[PDB]
């Protein structure tokens, strides 16, 4: 089917007017568009991409940490077992650390060697060469990266790291790599393997250049098919490194979007869109997440939040904490989105009331503990689930005032009658009830 190789949703900007035009915002967040390629974005805004060149990065912070992935240099769009016999889903991707200065030396010498090879003139496949990919470089420190982060404020508001319409701005604290910028340094063949974004939040990626990247994209509502493929091939969809066999996908009638990202092109990945990427030339990229205020985004975030619990994987976004912040601080005028949030809050409230009464009925004391504001959400020190309001802390951690948090289930498993724990409460019930009761649908004529 030609429908199995659909065209790329793609917008071509010439100037600042095009970039700030509101129908662009609406196109990107439309659930029918799994990905949007915004071509010419840097040129239209006169963004200085030179602030992210390797030369500039070395000067700025030469000892900065870089995560290295050591990989095989594979042909075109394929992934072969090391022997070169058959195409398989499993990637080879070994981890180590280096610095910006050291990776930079390698990136440059890699290009010089390729020039010389090009001038040396002239098991079904392979054997394959080894390459290194510098990934997940942390650009959160505004003191170390002042000029770099300022340049990204030139973007239209919907695409910024920080904005009033961004759910990740309303979380109220830092989530590393999501509401902070990540940087990637590349040589040809550098691969970011198959994945969905953390808790299915949208993402922004800009190619710094000078070389191109090639992207592969599958819509959110086929993610289940790719999950089945991973399990059949003995891989964890959420945690393993895998690179889809395009012939397998075609056979299973899964459509695949495929396109080239040139320097200055911005790629918008919509919520839950499955994707994997490879460098075609020598380049750097920057990326972060954004959470549009839509029913579709909130729904997919909640779904992945609950799926992660079943798979014993931590959620970087604390969706209970976020939901309360939305009710406290945000006027919601879409009836669909409003009903979703109200439903979730009522479920949180009922569970909390049920647990609290059980504790009281058993004669366990609930200790008023309160809360520092802008204090981050808490997670269980053993199982890493989000823990809200009622915190379970050992007698000794309480005494030492280290307040090491446990969920109810993990505390019970340790201490059958909770005799080794105290129960801390960060919010009064009457106050949460008020927030819930006062959270009402706002009128908007839009
Ligand atoms: Mn991604
Ligand atoms: Zn736990």
Curated annotation (Swiss-Prot):
Task: List localization entries.
Answer: Nucleus
**Every JmjC domain range:** 144-307
Annotated binding of Zn(2+), by residue? 380, 383, 407, 410
The UniProt annotation places Fe cation binding at 195, 197, 275
Instruction: According to the UniProt record, list the residues that bear Phosphothreonine.
Output: 8
The organism's superkingdom is given as Eukaryota
Give the UniProt family note: Belongs to the UTX family.
Q: How does it assemble?
A: Interacts with TLE1 and TLE2.
Q: What functional role does this protein have?
A: Male-specific histone demethylase that catalyzes trimethylated 'Lys-27' (H3K27me3) demethylation in histone H3. Has relatively low lysine demethylase activity.
Q: What is this protein called?
A: Histone demethylase UTY
Provenance organism: Homo sapiens (Human)
Q: Which gene encodes it?
A: UTY
Q: Which residues of the parent protein does this chain contain? A: 880 to 1344 of 1347
